[model samples]
Target: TRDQNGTWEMESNENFEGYMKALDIDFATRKIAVRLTQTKVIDQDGDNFKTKTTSTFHHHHHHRNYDVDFTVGVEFDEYTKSLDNRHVKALVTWEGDVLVCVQKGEKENRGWKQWIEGDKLYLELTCGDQVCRQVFKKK
Candidate 1:
């Protein structure tokens, strides 16, 4: 079985600002989020998982923190207070070994997909027509 139970640190991000812009995130927040180093801590228990995103930014003294818990095939409404500050209906599912999510909200085509390859984890975040690819290495 492929296990996604580990800590991952961000390695690279492609067009993250473009995705954020599509969600109407502010300029200052996007700048801070793009530069700050992000860490993802995920604990997977069968079909249920708990994930947290943590980052620190010194520019203008800001902090970013996020936590979410959900089960596969279950849909839940959540407030994304940490990032973008919006409400979304999120559904998570597994396609083979990849964990895919579809977030329905004000923004069109907003969602994220996660998968692990070798010793690295890949996350693709989408908003509107913009897509951001983020790569993370196991820690």
Candidate 2:
């Protein structure tokens, strides 16, 4: 939950497609999506938090920001139109110093962990047995 403001661009990723695979993403989509560089911008004002993820997931021609508004310890309906086009009950909470999210829907054991360490932002997405780890730097 520290240094979580401002914009950050993804510098590296690992097994992102594997995470998508668990989400049941199509083969054609995963092929192009694995090459996308995601930029996440988190705007926080006290207890109010909102994040927007920018990417070109539509055939590499269309661009959009998938925005979600959430607060710590509150579960809300989240429709991930960009990620896997699924609806889930999403909750964000801080576990010690790290910000964690748990998404409950069709997939089991689906969630993500975001934390800042040594001026670098890290995101770990997990679904089933696969994990996608991504690191970002200030933009």
Candidate 3:
């Protein structure tokens, strides 16, 4: 099983603008979000986990952070204030060693999948018909 308890820094992002657009983020926000380097801090305690996504950008002097908490196989309501400020019913489950989340809300087919590959972390974010893949390395 992949251990998901570390700080990972963004290395590359693929089609992130399309994914942000699907989330209804504004043009300025998407522009900043795509360029800023993001860091994910993950803390895992058995089936429960907490993740914090943070970024520091030149456009926005202050730092932006998004925190999420969830337990495996449990469903909960999530308010994503930082991204698009949307509410959704989120459920996280384990597909082998990979953590898969299914979010049901205003957007169709929206969710994310995360896993560790060798020395890197992989996150695949999906919304509507767009999918964005982000790779991160241990920091």
The candidate maximizing lDDT is: 3
Candidate achieving the largest TM-score: 3
Q: Any runs in candidate 1 off by more than 4 Å, and if so which?
A: 58-62
- lDDT score for residue 125 of model 1: 96
Q: For model 2, how does the per-residue alpha-carbon lDDT over 1-139 read when each residue is reduced to its tens digit?
A: 4658879888888999899999999998788885688789999875568888887553678776889889888899988887799999998888887888999887888999999987679999999999999999988
lDDT of 1 by residue, 29-88 (tens): 787775667889999998899999887663747657788899999999889887788989
For all predicted structures, in order, the TM-scores are: 0.92, 0.92, 0.94
Candidate 2 lDDT score at position 35: 68
TM-score of 1: 0.92
- In candidate 1, where is summed lDDT lowest over 10 consecutive residues? 55-64
- Candidate RMSDs in Å, in order, are 1.5, 1.8, 1.2
**Which pairs, if any, clash in model 2?**
none
> What local distance difference test score does each model get?
0.87, 0.86, 0.90
Worst 10-residue lDDT window for candidate 3 reads 28-37
